[PDB]
Ligand binder design. Structure first.
Ligand SMILES: OC[C@H]1O[C@H](O[C@H]2[C@H](O)[C@@H](O)[C@@H](O)O[C@@H]2CO)[C@H](O)[C@@H](O)[C@@H]1O
Lengths: 128, 514
């Protein structure tokens, strides 16, 4: 189990860094696609927050929890809505991201996108 | 000890100890009194320890906030400056060193944190905290970061905790109200939550300390730091083009840094009190002495009126004074020590994910306003059934096991800790001594695994104190009266019942059979 923990930590750091090939290699070697750090942040959380589209899609293909909530109440869709990542939000939705999930301030991805001027993203979210 | 005819001085490692040493050798040149400046580690903790037993420096330098508790413990000598001296410094800096109406230290200089930024990396510093995640994303793409500051010392996170409503002790009338603590209110939670989000989203690293944050900024790796005037000298020596400005706002309100008055108290145990007075009043607290220190590491805005000319002609002093006025000056009450230790734990634990913000802040509020499990040894804590129910307070301390010494107190969190029950009542008929060996083995086994045991009873007064004394007496081979004074010094309300005292007394005879 100790080796699986190492893989997980590298995966979190690779998803954070946007290192696509590294993430694939770690997926092939068996990394927990839902590895968590002490804040309950997943590699999907990090890829969505940091704009790594390709990585987002790999994690979801591999079975990432699309509605994972970190220790703080943030879901990947909350984090992607923060920066207006149309491409990332689209695949999160394709994979069943929950448009009604609330963050620690009670706000949904639609609320987050309106609060940041991502109004293109808001027209999309508004119909759901 | 402390030798007659010499001065020893302690000052923090971030202050201008070399420039102070230069004032000290002037003193030596003129008087032949050797002056030794030292900057020990954990100086604020170390000084009460050494000074309690009559050792330590002759003069100690710290911000005023620790000095009320130093005086309260009989560690400080009252200072008696002439009225013509008291007039050379700003009236309000004297107030900060006044405790129960006695002057207990010499004020030197007023300190407040500021936002320092690299003008090449970030021509226009942000006005708000809320902007900083977006800047860090921009900067990370060029291989820099937006902000690094010391996350191991709560002083550096306080301006953000307090911006929306955090406070230490509320100031009612003309006294501080030591039960009115604002550590877990809506404001403090908002601020700490924002700092935790910054970390969990990888904008800061919880391991950052003073030296890492100074290296990063002073090597151009990070665009902003949070620091006081003492730090400016190392940036000058570096190749960084920097500015010192207003701390950013949070939820539209300014950051409220705790403002510190650097102060020099005289050890109550020093046989050189007059020598200290002469050194401090006529060598250090002069324009020439303060300038020798200030050239080494800036003091900030010096308490000395005559410097309002030279100072405020510096924009970084202006920036310090602007952040200072947006802040509150620290109280000097003896409770500041417990308050800082409680907020330090909350910040480190929230910043590490060991505790949520709400659990971390709640634990610190209780410890600051009311108290909590008392440390006996690093792996061994003593407390009440109330504490045994506050999972946030056990977690804050890193408790892994509890000894529940009672017949009616539930084991609240059997999932999360190892429990040893000692089901005795606190009366003259209970044979608690039947459990001494059992309990010592439990403590020892938990310790040998690096854990921490919390021993409690109903009150934390008689049954659990009795177990804790039995551990000390057998583990270190000490008499009952020695063990009792050690614990009583740490938890002043312990009072084993008369039958428990006798059982410990008999257990003393068995453990020290000569
Ligand atoms: O971190 C809590 C700590 O903050 C203050 O210490 C400051 C000090 O005032 C400054 O002069 C400079 O040395 O930075 C220190 C931060 O480490 C309080 O004065 C201190 O009592 C408290 O523990």
């Amino acid at each position: 189990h100790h080796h699986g923990s190492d893989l997980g930590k590298k995966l979190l750091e690779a998803a954070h860094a946007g290192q696509d090939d590294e993430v694939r290699i770690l997926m092939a070697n068996g990394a927990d696609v839902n590895a968590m750090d002490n804040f309950g942040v997943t590699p999907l959380h990090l890829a969505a927050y940091w704009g790594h589209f390709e990585i987002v899609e790999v994690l979801l293909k591999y079975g990432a929890d699309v509605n994972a909530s970190d220790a703080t109440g943030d879901t990947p869709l909350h984090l992607a809505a923060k920066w207006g990542y149309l491409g990332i939000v689209e695949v999160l939705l394709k994979y069943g991201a929950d448009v009604n999930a609330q963050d620690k301030f009670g706000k949904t991805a639609f609320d987050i996108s309106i609060d940041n001027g991502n109004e293109d993203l808001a027209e999309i979210l508004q119909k759901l | 000890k402390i030798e007659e005819g010499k001065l020893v001085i302690w000052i923090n490692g971030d202050k201008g100890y070399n420039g102070l040493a230069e004032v000290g050798k002037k003193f030596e040149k003129d008087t032949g009194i050797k002056v030794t400046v030292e900057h020990p580690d954990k100086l604020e903790e170390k000084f009460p320890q050494v000074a309690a037993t009559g050792d330590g420096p002759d003069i100690i330098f710290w911000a005023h906030d620790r000095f009320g508790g130093y005086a309260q413990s009989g560690l400080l000598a009252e200072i008696t400056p002439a009225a013509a001296f008291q007039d050379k410094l700003y009236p309000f800096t004297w107030d900060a060193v006044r405790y129960n109406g006695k002057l207990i230290a010499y004020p030197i200089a007023v300190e407040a944190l500021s936002l320092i930024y690299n003008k090449d990396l970030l021509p226009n510093p942000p006005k708000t905290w809320e902007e900083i995640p977006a800047l860090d994303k921009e900067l990370k793409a060029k291989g820099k970061s937006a902000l690094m500051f010391n996350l191991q010392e709560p002083y550096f996170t306080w301006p953000l905790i307090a911006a929306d409503g955090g406070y230490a002790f509320k100031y009612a009338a003309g006294k501080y109200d030591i039960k009115d603590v604002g550590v877990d209110n809506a404001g403090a939670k908002a601020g700490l939550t924002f700092l935790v989000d910054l970390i969990k989203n990888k904008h800061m690293n919880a391991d950052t300390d003073y030296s890492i944050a100074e290296a990063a900024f002073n090597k151009g790796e990070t665009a902003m730091t949070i620091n006081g005037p003492w730090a400016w000298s190392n940036i000058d020596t570096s190749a960084v083009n920097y500015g010192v400005t207003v701390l950013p706002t949070f939820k539209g309100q300014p950051s409220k840094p705790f403002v510190g008055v650097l102060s020099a108290g005289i050890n109550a145990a020093s046989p050189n009190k007059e020598l200290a007075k002469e050194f401090l009043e006529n060598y250090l607290l002069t324009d020439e002495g303060l300038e020798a220190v200030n050239k080494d590491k800036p003091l900030g805005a010096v308490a000395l009126k005559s410097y309002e000319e030279e100072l405020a002609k510096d924009p970084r002093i202006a920036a310090t004074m602007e952040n200072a006025q947006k802040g509150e000056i620290m109280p000097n009450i003896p409770q500041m020590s417990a308050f800082w230790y409680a907020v330090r734990t909350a910040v480190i634990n929230a910043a590490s994910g060991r505790q949520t913000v709400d659990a971390a802040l709640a634990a610190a509020q209780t410890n600051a306003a009311a108290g909590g499990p008392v440390e006996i040894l690093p792996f061994l804590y003593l407390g009440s059934a109330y504490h045994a129910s506050r999972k946030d307070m056990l977690d804050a301390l890193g408790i892994t096991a509890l000894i529940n010494v009672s017949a009616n107190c539930p084991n609240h969190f059997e999932g999360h800790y190892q429990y040893k029950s000692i089901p005795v009542e606190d009366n003259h008929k209970a044979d608690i001594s039947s459990w001494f060996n059992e309990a010592i083995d439990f403590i020892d086994s938990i310790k040998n695994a690096g854990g921490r045991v919390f021993v409690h009873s109903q009150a934390g007064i008689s049954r659990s104190a009795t177990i804790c004394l039995a551990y000390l007496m057998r583990t270190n081979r000490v008499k009952l009266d020695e063990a009792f004074e050690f614990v009583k010094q740490r938890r002043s309300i312990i009072s084993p019942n008369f039958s428990f005292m006798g059982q410990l007394l008999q257990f003393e005879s068995q453990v020290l059979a000569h």
